Amino acid sequence: QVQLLESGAELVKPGASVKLSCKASGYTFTSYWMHWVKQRPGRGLEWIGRIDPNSGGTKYNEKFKSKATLTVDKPSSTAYMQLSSLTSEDSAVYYCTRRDSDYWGAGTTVTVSSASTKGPSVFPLAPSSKSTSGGTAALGCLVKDYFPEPVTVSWNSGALTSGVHTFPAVLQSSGLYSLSSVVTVPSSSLGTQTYICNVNHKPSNTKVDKKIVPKS
């Protein structure tokens, strides 16, 4: 059901299916074996199988024979991997490989859960007010209660990169994620320079720009 383009991230319900896509380079070769690899948090990489977009031939890891199906749309030179009867074990980052590239394809993420999509609430992490120092100050944004991952954060639309630290999300006992992003800047710039965190939670089509300043 759910279609997942290379480099994307999609939430899928347990028991349902998902189909990932990966375009071939388009270069002419006799064979063009593309491999699919699975990567989980605290687990080693696992090879799923390979498919030749030119012939359509395939070869699977016995372990994934019943859950993965590799196909190819020769006309559009696109390879596909369908994962069926999804379980929490299928949540992971998947990569497709190409013979004419030393880097594997981006990283495509599947999240298998029945929890509904929920956009985050963004709150300011304001610089020390009334008791501000003179050296370096810190400010940020707390992106709370969202599902599923991921959430991205930029500062001043990418213009501000020095001193920025965007932390890995943390899964709360509620089942929702929270993420913090901070930036350190000269305590003297707090009176002139504007600092805006740009938050995006694509899964819920939620985008927020929040200006952060010392509270009065």
């Binding site: 300011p124 100050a137 940020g140 630290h165 709360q172 901070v182």
Partner: protein
Amino acid sequence: ELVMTQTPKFMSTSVGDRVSITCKASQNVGTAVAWYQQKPGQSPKLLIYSASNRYTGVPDRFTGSGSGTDFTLTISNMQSEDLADYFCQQYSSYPLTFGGGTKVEIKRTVAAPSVFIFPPSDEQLKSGTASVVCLLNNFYPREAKVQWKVDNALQSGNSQESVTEQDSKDSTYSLSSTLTLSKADYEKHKVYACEVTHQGLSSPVTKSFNRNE
């Protein structure tokens, strides 16, 4: 299937030092072995193929060696940017299998964290919850302890923290800790403090604020 046993699982190397990682195949795999490097937030990159061949562009610092069942990946003159996870693979027998990986961290001089505390926003409070955040910036080593105190009462079970990946330039880490309380509980105390303990701090550093405004 054929199992590739990679060792060690974690390694801390100072810039300029040599890195030695090994992979042992449960059965003879000839020279059908490859080595990959995966940097934070990136996809794996092929470094070595057929046991000892460097992929075009890979510096001489990376050397793959071995045949049969014992393979080695050696990295000389370690650079701060070389931090990453390294994995081997055996493509001799199907299914193709990978080693468990080795996480290589950069070892540098100790750096004390710079601490900052953030009170909950009035906006969040209006929603019924209070998140208090403590930031520990640019420190090394990664080991650090954050103890939340509310009116001198030590908190436990109501905080979560996460750490950034090691900085490719200064080799430091940053950590953020969040103490979560209900608005009602938040309004039952006055002093909120974050006490930090770290190798680079002769005495713990505490940042705090009094609920108000």
